Symmetry: C3
Subunit: 254 residues, 3 copies
């Protein structure tokens, strides 16, 4: 039995919005301590791990863990009915064949009850997170969003390279080149909105932009994206939430 309600329906949509570089389809494991999901690129090159905690909801109740396999595209659509930011409630039962979605308005007071036919897919769950990453850095999602979108113009292949206190975003296609090169630093100034690099190694990794754009789509979710990168491993892009995160592991080329 499950009753999970976001105060602000806007949220769950945004989260679901971070698929679509995900395989139209996904399992939503609903434990006692919230929800997690796992989607993978059709060619197994990007992985989206989601985690939403109890404190992220307005109210949450899961009596016994239940796994909600569903078709994203489909669930995506139902979320359109959602006038975003008022009171999506998710619901399921002892044995679930469909998940129920209750949008609402509290004091305009119009409630609609949509159900989605549950898919039931086979769940090979992955734990590829490394402990140590050659480099970690975290800049504000919004900036990264441009740097991605901007380089994505020139090249199909965006190269990220970190040198001592120097991060270099370099795209080089056949039409031309471009490079964004930015300090860490920290202004004691605005708010956070600063650049944070802790380096253990140099790195020279290069990723398909097509994916980067699909990653940075979840730029809306956080203020600040944390990137981790290592040679023999993939890169981890992390957007943070009230008491959970959305994260994209994306394999580098070569």
């Amino acid at each position: 039995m499950l009753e999970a309600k976001f105060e602000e329906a806007s949220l769950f949509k945004r989260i679901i919005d971070g698929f679509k570089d995900c395989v139209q389809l996904v399992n939503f494991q609903c434990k006692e301590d919230g929800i997690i999901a796992q989607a993978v690129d059709d060619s197994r090159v990007l992985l989206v791990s989601l985690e939403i905690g109890v404190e992220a909801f307005q109210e949450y109740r899961c009596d016994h863990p239940v796994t909600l396999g569903m078709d994203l595209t489909s669930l995506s659509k139902i979320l359109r009915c959602g006038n975003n930011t008022d009171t999506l409630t998710l619901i399921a039962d002892n044995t679930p064949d469909s998940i129920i979605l209750l949008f609402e308005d509290t004091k305009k007071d119009r409630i609609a009850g949509y159900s989605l036919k549950l898919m039931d897919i086979d769940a090979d769950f992955l734990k590829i997170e490394e402990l140590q990453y050659d480099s970690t850095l975290s800049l504000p999602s919004s900036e990264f969003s441009k740097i991605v979108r901007d380089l994505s113009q020139l090249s199909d292949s965006i190269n990220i390279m970190i040198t001592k206190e120097t991060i270099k975003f370099v795209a080089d296609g056949d039409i031309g080149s471009g490079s964004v090169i930015i300090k860490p630093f920290v202004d004691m100034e605005h708010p956070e909105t600063s650049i944070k690099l802790e380096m253990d190694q140099p790195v020279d990794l290069t990723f398909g932009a097509k994916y980067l754009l699909d990653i940075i789509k979840g730029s809306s979710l956080s203020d600040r994206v944390g990137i981790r990168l290592s040679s023999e491993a993939p890169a981890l892009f992390q957007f943070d939430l009230k008491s959970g995160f959305l994260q994209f592991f994306l394999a580098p080329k070569f």
Copy 2:
């Protein structure tokens, strides 16, 4: 001879905007007491009846009734030249081969004179309005607009059913279900913006959404759409105007 001028050109466009689920083509019967038109779906399943009264214009003059058969799509385009909301004048003569359209600005004072080649089509005019409808109801266009657009996601086939003081909008496609269920009621409160049901029978009618969306397009014209529904008959959706209406008769499935 005809000289018909809307003060606000915005209007006539909006009205013409309620075709397009109409057959690119239509007769515009211009009597002494205003204009009426009649379009039908290519497959004869939707009917759009328009009526615009004298009081709806800023000025109107028809010396002898005249029938203006014209190509909507074409006339639609000329209306684009219209900076909406300033002084469309329609014009025609004793025997008409083209209708003239004079857009203007009163005190910016730029006038443009467009003519449209009159089509001349054969006019089987229909009077299928029943006297008694099993149920009448009227809610605010804007709400209905969502309920239509929203259910239109899940199903291709939206079912409207009225039970004693309970209207149920139910869409059930193969991807999932959805149901919007709303009271009548009346708040003595805001303005009108209330829900009005007078029931004589239960009804369980189901219509193609594809059409419903084409009907609710004319949501802009009124504040409040009046729906009438009966079993052996079609449904009548009515948007109201200064001294006239636009209305869609749409046949139910089965």
Copy 3:
């Protein structure tokens, strides 16, 4: 050697925006006194001549004249990286194989360095400007923009005709007709925003709208477009700049 920096990057984009009815490709001759370019329709019917002066830049330095042949579409894209209105710097060297573009923010202080592979195209440069034009007129770009876009609906062929103190923009396709007829005049009133006709002859010229729309795209650049027209010759549409212009010579039909 070249260092050319617009204070407001917005500008150079807008200028480049006035191609696309230009052959994806163009030479940019960078003299000591600024830049000029010349593009032509693939079928040689429209010509775009650009001239940007020193005073139009924030700073400009050309040590010896250099010619920058480049692919518009490509250069167009790099300009997207430009958050329009902050500090595009163009750069090239003694012998140039690529032009470098430095976007910036002055006190947000994020700099990106893009290079574009220089094309090298063969330069047949044209000087078809007549001295005397049967008629000159200049109205505000914005008005002309509508009159073009509006007539462009009815016809494929827009006819401009100037009679004594009467300019007549007439489109007549097969769907219908339209005519915009406007006085010169002058209100000593608003600002400029007046209509200016000096006539030496009648004219009855007719141009492809498809092009007119491509011409009036550069409506953003000036407030006021100057049109010149002569029978045996093409028409000259001129948009004006800080210390230069963009201009379209377009041949009339027949």
